[PDB]
Each structure stands twice: as C-alpha cells, then as structure tokens.
Design a protein around this ligand. Structure first.
Ligand SMILES: CC(C)(c1cc(Br)c(O)c(Br)c1)c1cc(Br)c(O)c(Br)c1
Length: 261
C-alpha cells in the first residue's frame, strides 16, 4: 500500500547509491571469503614473511606500516561515506554545519559497521579483498599496536551473526548518519524527521527481508552501543600513539574527526 510503497521506494534508492558509493560490498566480501566462483581467492598474510611476500603487489617498520595503511584506507572510507550521505534524501538540504557535524561523528561508527562485512572470526579482507590478514597476526603486533583490531573483530562477530545483507546495511548506515543527538547540532528537529523516516524504512526492510527473524530491528538498533564503544576505545588508543610515537604522522582529515569526539 501507498505508505509501504513510499518506504520500499526509499529502500531501493539507498541500496542503489550504496552500491554506487562502495566498491567492496558485503556480497562481494562473502564471495571472496567463503570460496565462491564469481570472485578471486585472496592472498593470505599470517606472519612476517608472508607479509613480505604479499608486499610485492596487493617504510618505518611492520606494525607502524600496517597501521598507517588502515588509516589511509579510513580516509578513503570517509570519502565513500561522504558521497553516500549526500545521496540521503534531505541530507544536503540541512544546515551546512550540521551536515559537517553529522559526518564528524558518523563516519567511524559506519566504518566499523561495514568493516564487519570484510571480517570473519579468523581475519579481515584488505587491499580491496585481494588480501586477507589474519586476526592472530594483527593481535601479535608489538603493543600498543597488537590491540587496535581486536575490538573490531569482537563487534564484527556479534554483528555478523545478525546476518544482514547490503540492502539492510544501506538503510542502517543512513540511520546512523542522521542521528539527531550529536554534539553541537544547530537544528536537531529536521534531522530527526529524516531519521524517523529512515527508521521506518528499516523496520519494513528487515521485516520483509528477514521475516523469520524475531525483533531484528530492535536487535540491530541495540548494536549502536557497541559501535560507540569501539569508537571511543579507538580514540583512546590514538591518544596513546600520538604520545609515544611522535614521529608517526596522522592524516589531517582524520585529525579533524578525532578532535573532541
Ligand atoms: C585493515 C582494513 C580492514 C581496515 C580498514 C579501515 Br577503513 C580501517 O579503519 C581499519 Br582500523 C582497518 C583494511 C581494509 C581494506 Br579493503 C584495505 O584496502 C586496507 Br589497506 C585495510
């Protein structure tokens, strides 16, 4: 019926621009990870030598070198997410400062939601899925660097259990961006009206897409406490790095997001 239709229409619209804005979807990710024939097997990096062997395609010192990598990829993700946000009906019509504020707080929560897509209990796709880097290798890195990925993996395992597909996530990450309770928002109300609409998009999306799945909407919403969790941990992890590795550069775009989080 006409309300549903309007919401389904919204669902399709977001799935479509989500596909357009993100080169490594979950569907691709799982094909690579599970061993399907639509895609290519990843090289696997499980230790120092394979790191060195993987290098050739796919300089300070390993742990820092890997870390810098995750960060540069973060910046790209920020761009990806920024382009996607623009496609969210009403988003570019907001106060410019709120648009900025929504992204400042939004992108990390979204980065880790989608990073889940690239993860299973044993490791994570890198270099656009050409690589795979195992959780143990990471966890093995010289502290404090052995610690930046574990909390991600932890969330990812819980979260991947919900069994969401890209078309569920497209709406979910829209919901995240359009969070009216962000620090310093000028006009909360129009932000809430859009989110009210996205939420309704999601509630229907989940019920149609996952009908046997009880209270998935509620369960998916509850997952945001985990996101903020790992997001704050990360910035604590960074305050420490900055403190001990004063020769390690940090990207300005990322310095902007990190400040006063
Ligand atoms: C390691 C990982 C998953 C990563 C990405 C982001 Br964004 C992060 O913020 C954090 Br922390 C880790 C990644 C994924 C892809 Br695909 C890559 O091409 C590369 Br190079 C690295």
């Amino acid at each position: 019926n006409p309300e549903s239709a309007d919401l389904r229409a919204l669902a399709k619209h977001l799935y479509d621009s989500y596909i357009k804005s993100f080169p490594l979807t979950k569907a691709k990710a799982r094909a690579i990870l599970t061993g399907k024939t639509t895609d290519k097997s990843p090289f696997v990096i499980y230790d120092m030598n394979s790191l060195m062997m993987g290098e050739d395609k796919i300089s300070k010192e390993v742990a820092i070198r890997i870390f810098q990598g995750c960060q540069f990829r973060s910046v790209e993700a920020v761009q990806e997410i920024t382009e996607y946000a623009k496609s969210i009906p009403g988003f570019v019509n907001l106060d410019l400062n709120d648009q900025v504020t929504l992204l400042k707080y939004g992108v990390h929560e979204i980065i880790y939601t989608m990073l889940a897509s690239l993860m299973n209990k044993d490791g994570v796709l890198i270099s656009e899925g050409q690589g795979f880097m195992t959780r143990e290798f990471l966890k093995s890195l010289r502290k404090p660097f052995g610690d930046f990925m574990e909390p991600k993996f932890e969330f990812a395992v819980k979260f991947n259990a919900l069994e969401l597909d890209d078309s569920d996530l497209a709406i979910f990450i829209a919901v995240i961006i359009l969070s009216g309770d962000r620090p310093g928002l000028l006009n909360v109300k129009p932000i809430e009206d859009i989110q009210d609409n996205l939420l309704q998009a999601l509630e229907l999306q989940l019920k149609l897409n996952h009908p046997e799945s009880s209270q998935l909407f509620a369960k998916l919403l509850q997952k945001m406490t985990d996101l903020r969790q790992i997001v704050t941990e990360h910035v604590q992890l960074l305050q420490v790095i900055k403190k001990t590795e004063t020769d390690m550069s940090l990207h300005p775009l990322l310095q902007e997001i990190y400040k006063d989080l």
